[PDB]
Design a protein around this motif. Structure first.
Motif, mmCIF file in Angstrom:
data_model
loop_
_atom_site.group_PDB
_atom_site.id
_atom_site.type_symbol
_atom_site.label_atom_id
_atom_site.label_comp_id
_atom_site.label_asym_id
_atom_site.label_seq_id
_atom_site.Cartn_x
_atom_site.Cartn_y
_atom_site.Cartn_z
ATOM 1 N N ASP A 105 0.641 -1.321 0.234
ATOM 2 C CA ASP A 105 0.106 0.281 0.066
ATOM 3 C C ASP A 105 0.872 1.056 0.240
ATOM 4 O OD1 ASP A 105 -2.309 -1.792 -0.109
ATOM 5 O OD2 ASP A 105 -2.858 -0.718 2.308
ATOM 6 N N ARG A 106 1.882 1.453 0.703
ATOM 7 C CA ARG A 106 2.518 2.659 1.117
ATOM 8 C C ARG A 106 3.399 3.010 0.123
ATOM 9 N NH1 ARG A 106 5.665 -0.249 5.426
ATOM 10 N NH2 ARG A 106 7.114 -0.712 5.591
ATOM 11 N N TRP A 107 4.363 1.525 -0.461
ATOM 12 C CA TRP A 107 4.534 2.152 -2.083
ATOM 13 C C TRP A 107 4.009 2.717 -3.411
ATOM 14 C CZ3 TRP A 107 8.427 -2.574 -0.136
ATOM 15 C CH2 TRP A 107 9.578 -1.514 1.019
ATOM 16 N N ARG A 108 3.061 1.623 -3.086
ATOM 17 C CA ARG A 108 2.044 2.163 -4.055
ATOM 18 C C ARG A 108 1.680 3.499 -4.709
ATOM 19 N NH1 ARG A 108 -2.781 -0.958 -4.893
ATOM 20 N NH2 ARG A 108 -2.341 -1.376 -2.660
ATOM 21 N N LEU A 109 1.261 3.897 -3.623
ATOM 22 C CA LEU A 109 0.940 5.385 -3.337
ATOM 23 C C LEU A 109 1.887 6.514 -3.642
ATOM 24 C CD1 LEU A 109 -0.748 7.007 -2.552
ATOM 25 C CD2 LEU A 109 -0.552 7.226 -0.424
ATOM 26 N N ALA A 110 2.758 5.906 -3.508
ATOM 27 C CA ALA A 110 3.804 6.667 -3.343
ATOM 28 C C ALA A 110 4.458 6.542 -5.125
ATOM 29 C CB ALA A 110 5.310 6.383 -3.279
ATOM 30 N N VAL A 111 4.188 5.539 -5.863
ATOM 31 C CA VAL A 111 4.542 5.342 -7.710
ATOM 32 C C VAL A 111 3.158 5.972 -8.242
ATOM 33 C CG1 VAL A 111 4.491 4.218 -9.758
ATOM 34 C CG2 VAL A 111 5.931 3.204 -6.969
ATOM 35 N N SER A 112 2.291 6.296 -7.678
ATOM 36 C CA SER A 112 1.045 6.505 -7.878
ATOM 37 C C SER A 112 0.732 7.838 -8.126
ATOM 38 C CB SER A 112 -0.344 6.542 -7.225
ATOM 39 O OG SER A 112 -0.054 7.287 -6.350
ATOM 40 N N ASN A 113 2.255 8.678 -7.356
ATOM 41 C CA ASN A 113 1.387 10.210 -7.968
ATOM 42 C C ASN A 113 2.904 11.062 -8.824
ATOM 43 O OD1 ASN A 113 0.141 10.453 -5.804
ATOM 44 N ND2 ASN A 113 1.520 11.040 -4.188
ATOM 45 N N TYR A 114 3.803 9.687 -9.430
ATOM 46 C CA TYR A 114 4.874 10.780 -9.881
ATOM 47 C C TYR A 114 4.190 10.487 -11.769
ATOM 48 C CZ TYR A 114 8.514 9.164 -6.945
ATOM 49 O OH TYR A 114 9.666 9.145 -5.308
#
Ligand SMILES: Nc1ncnc2c1ncn2[C@@H]1O[C@H](COP(=O)(O)OP(=O)(O)O)[C@@H](O)[C@H]1O
Ligand SMILES: [Mg+2]
Ligand SMILES: [Mg+2]
Length: 359
Positions: free
Chosen positions: A155-164
């Motif tokens: 979750d916490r790393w898919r959300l970071a890649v989401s905002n790229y």
């Protein structure tokens, strides 16, 4: 970064190092990541014996960033202190403003070639089985989040890649694997409810690779607990099984080699699971039923599916954190992990294991 300051801190914060001065101390940075500024701090051997210093080396760890180390929070130190108290992690020696000092473990980490040694594999399964019994044999802090880290890391790393902005991957669609990430978590919630020993939720290392297992020759010891937490124990083994195909010691671009043919053999997987359960179940180890083994091995391959998505997201964030000062190709590594996800998912569907996955 300043070497003289490191000496001044260690002379002050390592016991009986007060006998020495700055010109008796050696500071040597060791290779790591960039969330770490790890140094091997030592006292010169000639001075060390005439002064009779028994602790020759220490691990000097400088905490990198706070949200540019966007992986763990401050819970890393609280977890490490627990692992240090139970003699699982390297002993915490002292702390300072910006980092900490740890017990120096003599020896070298395991190589990619050591993973082909059957006695090494058995020794790893012994340590891992004994390690995974900690949650039930000792008392862990009651306020820890018992959510399996396969969910938290995904979750916490898919959300970071989401905002790229516009990844422009190779084979473009980063959002395809973002959607695949939701399908694995929805699937694995249903799958891990089947009564399987591999679905036991214990305290896991969550980064089992060869460069995190020290060969002290006294024993095999674990290090680097920054991602450790509660998880399905099969996720710890799946990570180790995957890592038998990745060699990080290659010293030219892209600074790693993927040899999928070097995957741990079926015989070695059975031997590993056999040896693991001999120490995890501890008492009635008779559950070395072949049906139980073929089942451990299945849940391992299922957790491996999500691990490729987890560490591909991790690599993408690491690629943007290193954006323009690079050596390791995190973006190529991310693609290799995404490619491993496509191959593993197709292999799992070929055996009709991830049913209702919605492709
Ligand atoms: N206590 C220790 N004693 C000796 N060497 C260590 C110790 N801790 C770390 N190292 C060395 O540092 C390297 C990487 O450190 P690690 O904690 O794995 O950081 P990261 O993996 O986050 O870069 C390891 O390969 C190991 O050789
Ligand atoms: Mg490491
Ligand atoms: Mg690490």
């Amino acid at each position: 970064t300043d070497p003289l300051y490191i000496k001044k801190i260690c002379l002050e914060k390592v016991h009986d190092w007060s006998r020495c001065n700055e010109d008796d101390v050696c500071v040597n940075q060791i290779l790591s990541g960039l969330t770490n500024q790890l140094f091997e701090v030592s006292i010169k051997e000639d001075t060390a014996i005439e002064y009779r210093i028994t602790r020759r080396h220490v691990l000097f760890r400088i905490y990198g960033k706070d949200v540019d180390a966007l992986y763990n929070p401050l819970s890393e130190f609280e977890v490490y202190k627990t692992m240090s108290k139970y003699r699982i992690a390297p002993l915490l020696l002292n702390t300072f403003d910006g980092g900490r000092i740890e017990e120096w473990l003599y020896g070298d980490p395991l190589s990619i070639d050591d993973l082909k040694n059957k006695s090494i594999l058995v020794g790893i399964a012994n340590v891992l089985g004994k390690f995974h019994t900690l949650s039930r044999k000792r008392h862990l802090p009651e306020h820890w989040d018992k959510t399996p880290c396969v969910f938290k890391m995904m979750d916490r790393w898919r959300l970071a890649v989401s905002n790229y902005k516009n990844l422009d991957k190779v084979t473009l669609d980063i959002n395809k694997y973002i959607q695949e990430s939701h399908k694995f978590l929805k699937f694995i919630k249903i799958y891990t409810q089947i009564e399987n020993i591999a679905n036991d939720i214990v305290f896991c290392h969550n980064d089992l690779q060869e460069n995190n297992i020290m060969n002290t020759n006294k024993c095999l010891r674990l290090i680097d607990f920054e991602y450790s937490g509660y998880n399905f124990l099969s996720a710890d083994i799946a990570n180790f099984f995957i890592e038998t195909t990745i060699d990080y010691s290659y010293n030219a671009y892209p600074f790693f080699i993927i040899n999928k043919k070097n995957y741990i053999s079926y015989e070695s997987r059975i031997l590993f699971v056999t040896t693991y359960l001999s120490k995890y179940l501890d008492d009635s180890t008779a559950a070395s039923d072949q049906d139980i083994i073929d089942q451990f091995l299945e849940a391992i391959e299922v957790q491996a599916l999500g691990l490729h998505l987890i560490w591909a997201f991790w690599s993408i964030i690491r690629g943007y954190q290193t954006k323009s000062y690079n050596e390791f190709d995190f973006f190529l590594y991310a693609k290799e992990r995404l490619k491993m996800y496509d191959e593993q998912k197709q292999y799992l569907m070929s055996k009709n294991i991830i049913k209702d996955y919605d492709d």
